[PDB]
Design a protein around this ligand. Structure first.
Ligand code: NI
Ligand code: NI
Ligand code: NI
Ligand code: NI
Ligand code: NI
Ligand code: NI
Lengths: 100, 566, 101, 566, 566, 100
């Protein structure tokens, strides 16, 4: 595979998201790290699918709602940022106020 | 020109009269003073103030600071104030107003070409924590502790060996030398404790002359009156501290016999509540004496629903006890008491207990000293309301009382307060930057001796340092020679004199301990209470002046499930 | 309950109190935008800005520290200035002072 | 004896006239020359040529090379040739024909008992890349860059501090000293840049004498004519380079005023297109001047569908701008222009822009300098066809023009071309081995000063080094003392003279920079074009000799989704 | 007082007459002797024996050990006994009875204030393993090997280069120097092998004088009679060892010609069975000669169902052979023979083969030397029953015979048995602690020169060191200066004399090899059999005294799927 | 997410448990590391759910039975210990003889 450090680092984000995904499935209100991981992973997959940066900046604000996370969490996450390999290379996706 | 207080707060952080919630607790701090001149605040960025001829002057390096922390909200034992912090030559230069004297008024911290900038607006800055109950079971503890905001670690050990699992002792010259050499590789200031359990003074002097800054008396090695006396005599001679884990078994005597053996000499009592060790069931009465500097280890802090349940097995593994041996289990049980555990929280709130520590991997959590200290403060406010010393509608005094427990008091107790312990001029620049929402839980930046040593860092290949995944990674201050320059290895005056550093070829900065024998309970900042305390021998109830001291266990705590992934 | 929330007391802050101030009309005669920072020596700003430079000597914009005023091409506007303090020695910028005053 | 060209290609790699596709791009290189003697090629393995008395001779160590790269396809600014490479004493010994003179003809690279072998048949070998826009935000960037094929990093910083987040400056003697010491721990050659923004020359001389090989003028610290002049005067005195990030705000003047302030003196302009910083909207016109060495940072390379969209927020975070402050957002927007972004690609293809760099974690991706350079080449071939300088049906000239952008030109610009930058005799042996299918993306081997420093490595417990998982792991060349011997720390002539290395006890090899003031646009290999370029003040259209310069954004790019897991 | 043998076993570990199963194998060891005095055993913990005035005396550091391993079950070539182990100054002080002579009888290992304690009751303690077939393909192999229980690694290489992939050679002075410097960073004792394939003696003397403790003759570099002779002549001169990988191709002669070239001189034959290399198909006949010290690499150990299937592709990749070249595949196939593979196991059981080794990442698994050795022992007991030398109903002799294969015999073969190889007084304290259930698979503690270097470690933030996840993490003995003090770099007598250590500024302890030319087959502990062995040229059947030597392949093995996650 | 070392370390335990979970699903008798990982992860989730230390000390003994693991395995695991963030902070759960 010849995994570079950055690819290995992203594997850490993917795994953190697996943790959150399963807890959300159980019906738990997600905490700070879980929320950040879940939304981040979603965007990375969007990039793998070939969606645009513009599309993801919007879609990422509809992954989790205020009722699916603990109190204070939405305010602890003014934005989420993550980069991924789009068909046209690495790009940065910034999702402002992802949780409403 | 005018600006609203809200826009101002958003731009430069809060000012005099503004309040800030500490993380997700009920504790609120209020800005007591602001050392700036409104309109002359320094800010860095494109088109901002810190630029040539403007907020940055023309002075040579010797006439300006190496680093400035702009618009920091300082929280320390002496005050909660808004100000700029200047760092020069790895030490705290000044707390005041930064800028360029050429065009700005009241500049006390000059910014020049040689000055780096750390933007602290909206952030809280504290001194690095100091943990004095470290079991050197593994080197990984240093990074775990640094990440939590602890910059100095005092303890003993040789690795994951039986003796170290149970006690904070680095036994003898050879091991002491090896660990001093290994210390250069760790990103925290370090001081070692030798094995103080012996009745031949020369066996102790050898260890001190080898490098230890203290001696640990532990019951597992025999905390008898003869051993205690021998250790205190050598301590008085060589100006080093003694830490005590007393005779839980009451084998050689009761608490009063131990107290008699100490004979009024200065001593630091570890886990004074008793769960972690000490005369059952009344070692806690030690906090009434003027020569005792009392600390708590962290698993019992604060009293919660699951506290008692988790303690039995933790106790057994730590001290190599056999659950099949009746006497081994009976003595484990005699250490865990809901009565003394519940009182311990109140005694901290009153300032009868002066320090908090971990007891790392030996009935204690290395990354939870700071966190658990604030949880106790929260629970006490919730249960007892405002302290008598409190003025105004804020928890400023309770905050100062509790922060002193893991900063200045541990430094005073071990004779290193001349180097670290607080944000004061001349002290080593060990500082921790916190976003208010993560205060006491996950810091934004950890500075060791003027250099950032660790901090949360996003994608290395990203266009900015913020993209995910963000996790704690070592920085330049933790690298090779830079690390040696930014950390201190504490030595006893004797070792320093005998040239131990040159002989072992220690590469880090060296500091010597002093003033260990003269410190007393009255010297503990905001925590000098000497209560008339008693413990009922049958019921274990703790009473101060006849009043029952107790509290309720928490079901849920702040600084817990909202921040951690596991 | 919002972790780390502020409870800012209402009201306002008065900036640069007790210092001499002056207002001047400035006009951007260039074809490109020009933005000026709070602490820049106003008398030495981009030559394309037309105003009474002599009056602006030893002055900077009387605006919150860290903010700026923008002048689009052709834009004319009145700005308020506040005098420098400290030693009142001006060094740098376009190199027109390089000393006290 | 005869052998078909296909079987030959399979055995020893391609030869004269054979073409090879670079990764998954449309770029094809053709072997221009082969220095072997058909039938006398050296090959290592059981029953092969390199064996005692056969391809290996009887010479003592002094009479043979330490390492030979057999059958390598060299791609460098001077040619694309097939040959054996000899490395001796950490430096490039010769490019020619390896073997044993005792029984083989034309041997110019002697192989003896003291010779190690690296089989490069079927592989492409290039010099290690040189990135001159490094923000030292974190030490992890060094490994990320090394893995991508970059062996030298020039930049400034002190860690994740506000100043370093925005600028490439290591402010003052103390920080400069600390970072020089920390540099010994990193597996790449390093040179530091100090803060050049000041109008007092002595404040600059101090920094140069302390160790920096250049001075960074950044608008965040005030890129005024007075500061620029002061920095250039000291640069002319001490033979160090100046990197410029100009006044985007046009606060002190327009581009022509800055150009006037420079006064014909040599200067390296960072991100000359402007998105990363510079006079809006015409800093790009700087590439017309003979004294300007222009570079591009990498996020804008090449122009793609998502380029514009991602830039606004990247800009804000990097430079500590407030999205709520209208003037902060307006100035961010004035930097991002589709017009100048589209022209930048063409200007590279024409050789008007001479270097590529990252701008690591401050509007740039540290592991993507090489990769993005080849993507621009691909897109330009696709859009503009063959270059006028191209001969034959191949892209050999375009390849040489683009590889020069991150190898020799950066080295010439910063005065270190006497040590690194190309595969030439006498230069440090910093080489990168690539399989054609992964060219520019993931290298097979990264050699630092004659020792492999990093490479993909399979299961450590496996019977061979190839089983999964295969990922990049540090090798012996990146370990302790071996690392110090295989890396260089660049110093200014003054620092070297003052004995800075001995004082700081720097352990790595030291190299001094020189020839920074005499280099000009005409010296940039294959990239010396000085176009009559203009920018429309209202529309932002770029024109060269009145012709509109533009290009189309890519929807999909090579060296992207076929190679990366995320 | 009396105590039942079961309760006793549970408290202090087994005693004389008790048997213990080694992991999940069918091998049982029986305690042959116990050096304690019943009732006077030392135990550490709260209220236990090792306490001031009790099990711990009043002696100064010079009069007591630095570390004691209490109640250890020692398994070594000389015996399987129960005893306390004393370690002083990084070396094995004594095997006997620990305690305080003041109140206890028969104390031979004094415990004082300066003594650390490691509780070994219920544990098996062995000397650290010694692997003599290391290919230095990557630095990560050191940690993998240390974790498995191997503390000394002898081999050659420069990193993942073609030459190192195939041979254990560090070619020439420059590379030798670089690797010696890199060795200081690894937590294992190291000795290097140079390239011995040359017919000019001076080219070899240079390498020995540079630092290598041996010379590797490998067919890939030409294992001709002239090269072999030249290497042996220099070896006899400089007291260094020669390792041989013979001419598989029979290109220069047959096995008898090679044997003739050796001329009765001492030589270590690598992978003597042949799969890993050597005259096809009879290199295995080498074990009949008195001057040959024979070893096996580990992929063929023991013979199993999947052994043959996995070997072809492993062979090709290692030696850079082309599967499309008929002669390359034919010679690979001639090396893999079920006949010699099946005999190899029996020859080990009989003691005709004296050592086991890995052949790390070049047809061998670095973390499986110990594990595979015990699997061969298990399979041989299962198939052949008790050895003729066996007394009592236990496998004590077979155990001693097999443990000698990766401890003392490798040390004797390479001239380092004066420093390491067994648990004997005066030798470096390289010890491995094992829980019986994980014996040979995953150790509880790995001690390097008196300090724990690596061990399984649970949650760093936990209240105890046992909570999950538990995985191997480096300890203090593997850190910076402490590591240098606890490891040895072996040098040739010549290098040591020429001051190579001072010149290269090597920081670790230095040891010199000696007695490499005088060691012979008769000296191999419990493995000195010189069988009248023959190999059928057409059928490949191995016969000893006309009897066919063979065995059956295992379908399932112990120390495999019950312990590993993957 | 600002993951501390301990949080990252727990991600290793979670992943080891995913491996075991899938093999158990296939009907395989679990080995030593697989058993320890599976039971450990279970407890960590219990803590995330808010169960008490007392409840988990019992529940953890009913995750795997002797018939679901290889011979010798139950005896190789006299107890399992793991810490997690309960609603009231980090606590240690010790499950004695988890496999019967
Ligand atoms: Ni204790
Ligand atoms: Ni303790
Ligand atoms: Ni820039
Ligand atoms: Ni930059
Ligand atoms: Ni071999
Ligand atoms: Ni080999």
């Amino acid at each position: 595979m010849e995994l570079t450090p950055r690819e290995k680092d992203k594997l850490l984000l993917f795994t953190a998201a697996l943790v959150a995904e399963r807890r959300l499935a159980r019906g738990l209100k997600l905490n700070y790290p879980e929320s950040v991981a879940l939304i981040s992973a979603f965007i990375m997959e969007g990039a793998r699918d070939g969606k645009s940066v513009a599309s993801l900046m919007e879609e990422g604000r509809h992954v989790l709602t205020r009722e699916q996370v603990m109190e204070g969490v939405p305010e602890m996450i003014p934005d989420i940022q993550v980069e991924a390999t789009f068909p046209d290379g690495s790009k940065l996706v910034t999702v402002h106020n992802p949780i409403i | 020109s005018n600006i609203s207080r809200q826009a101002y707060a958003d731009m430069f952080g809060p000012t005099v009269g503004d309040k800030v919630r500490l993380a997700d607790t009920e504790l609120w701090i209020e800005v007591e003073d602001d050392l700036t001149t409104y309109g002359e605040e320094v800010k860095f960025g494109g088109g901002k103030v810190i630029r040539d001829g403007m907020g940055q002057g023309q002075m040579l390096a010797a006439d300006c600071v190496d680093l400035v922390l702009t618009n920091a909200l300082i929280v320390d034992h002496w005050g909660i104030v808004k100000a700029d912090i200047g760092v020069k030559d790895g030490r705290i230069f000044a707390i005041g107003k930064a800028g360029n004297p050429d065009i700005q008024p009241n500049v006390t911290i000059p910014i020049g070409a040689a000055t780096e900038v750390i933007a602290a607006e909206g952030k809280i800055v504290t001194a690095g924590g100091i943990d004095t109950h470290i079991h050197w079971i593994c080197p990984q503890q240093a990074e775990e502790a640094l990440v939590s905001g602890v910059t100095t670690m005092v303890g003993g050990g040789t690795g994951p060996a039986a003796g170290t699992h149970a006690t904070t002792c680095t036994p003898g010259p050879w091991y002491i030398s090896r660990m001093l050499q290994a210390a250069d590789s760790l990103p925290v200031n370090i001081g070692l404790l030798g094995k103080g359990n012996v009745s031949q003074p020369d066996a102790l002097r050898e260890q001190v002359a080898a490098g230890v800054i203290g001696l640990k008396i532990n019951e597992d090695w025999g905390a008898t009156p003869a051993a205690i006396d021998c250790a205190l005599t050598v301590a008085d001679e060589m100006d080093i501290q003694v830490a005590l884990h007393s005779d839980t078994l009451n084998e050689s005597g009761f608490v009063e016999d131990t107290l008699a053996a100490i004979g009024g000499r200065t001593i630091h009592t570890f886990h004074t509540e008793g769960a972690g060790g000490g005369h059952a069931p009344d070692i806690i009465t030690a906090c009434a004496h003027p020569n005792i500097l009392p600390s708590s280890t962290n698993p019992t802090l604060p009293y919660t629903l699951n506290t008692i349940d988790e303690h039995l097995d933790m106790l057994m593994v730590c001290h190599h006890l056999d659950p099949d041996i009746a006497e081994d289990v009976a003595f484990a049980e005699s250490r865990i008491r809901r009565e003394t555990i519940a009182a311990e929280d109140v005694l901290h709130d009153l300032g009868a207990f002066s320090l908090t520590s971990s007891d790392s991997q030996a009935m204690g959590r290395v990354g939870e000293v700071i966190l658990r200290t604030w949880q106790v403060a929260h629970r006490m406010k919730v249960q007892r309301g405002a302290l008598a010393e409190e003025t105004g509608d804020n928890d400023n005094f309770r905050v100062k009382r509790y922060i002193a427990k893991y900063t200045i008091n541990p430094a005073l107790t071990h004779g290193i307060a001349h180097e670290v312990g607080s944000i004061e001029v001349g002290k080593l620049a060990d500082l921790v930057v916190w976003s208010p929402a993560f205060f006491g839980v996950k810091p934004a930046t950890v500075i060791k001796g003027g250099m950032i040593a660790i901090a949360p860092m996003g994608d290395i290949n990203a266009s900015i340092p913020t993209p995910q995944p963000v996790h704690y990674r070592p920085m330049f201050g933790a690298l090779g020679s830079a690390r040696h320059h930014c950390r201190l290895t504490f030595l006893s005056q004797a070792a320093a004199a005998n040239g131990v550093a040159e002989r072992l070829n220690l590469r880090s900065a060296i500091a010597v301990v002093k003033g260990c024998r003269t410190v007393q309970k009255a010297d503990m900042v905001h925590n000098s209470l000497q209560p008339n305390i008693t413990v009922d021998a049958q019921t274990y109830e703790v009473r101060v002046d006849g009043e029952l001291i107790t509290s309720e266990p928490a079901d849920v705590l702040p600084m817990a499930q909202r921040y951690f992934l596991f | 309950m919002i972790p780390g929330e502020y409870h800012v007391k209402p009201g306002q802050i008065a900036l640069n109190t007790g210092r001499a101030t002056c207002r001047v009309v400035v006009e951007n005669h260039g074809d490109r935008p020009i933005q000026v920072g709070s602490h820049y020596h106003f008398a030495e700003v981009n030559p394309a800005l037309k105003f009474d430079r002599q009056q602006a000597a030893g002055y900077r914009l009387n605006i919150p520290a860290g903010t700026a005023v923008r002048f689009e091409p052709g834009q004319k506007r009145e700005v308020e200035l506040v005098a420098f303090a400290g030693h009142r020695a001006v060094f740098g910028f376009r190199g027109e002072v390089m000393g006290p005053l």
